[PDB]
Design a protein around this ligand. Sequence first.
Ligand code: CA
Length: 240
Amino acid sequence: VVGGTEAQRNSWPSQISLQYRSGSSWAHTCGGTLIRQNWVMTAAHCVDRELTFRVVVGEHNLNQNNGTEQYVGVQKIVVHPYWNTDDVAAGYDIALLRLAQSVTLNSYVQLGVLPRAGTILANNSPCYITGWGLTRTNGQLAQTLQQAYLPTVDYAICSSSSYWGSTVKNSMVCAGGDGVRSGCQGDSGGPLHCLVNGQYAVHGVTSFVSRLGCNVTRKPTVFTRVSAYISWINNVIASN
Ligand SMILES: [Ca+2]
């Protein structure tokens, strides 16, 4: 997250760190949202590589013991069947990870609230992106979980020529684009939390930013629109 501030430890308890095994250690690669005690929602592109993955819940600082972490292997990876790695702009950038064990819920580990199917946010709706992604374009990952206020940019505006044009689909949510604050590499798969009727819900799964850079004016961060996938998510959980 570029232009973020450090999240409080208990603000975003559905946020997870998706990590892969690298030699004798583990490396953060993406975020995700805990949606059941044994299921995580993340981006399809986060799991294109043939890696060994684990999920960390109750994580705050990637580089030190928080006394709250639970570490769990990934048992099954269900990518949306229409996902195509060659074409992030097509959408379908979503995957569900079935965890090898069910995690224990507490102040630091909670299920993310998902929007009702089909829900669309008004332009400029209040949302926060969270993650440990790069804190600058071509920068380094955050140690501590970051948050940035990224108001939505509606589909009409976001798919206009000066923004993302036809690259953005109605299956996506855009947010930010102020040139200062944005998601960045390593935030992919994590939540966009938006305030609706007094409750934060996870409306987006971070998907892409501009090739030109993370915080680029009129290139808001693009997210898979969770509310377009409620049936798909329910269908997967019910059959696995
Ligand atoms: Ca830690």
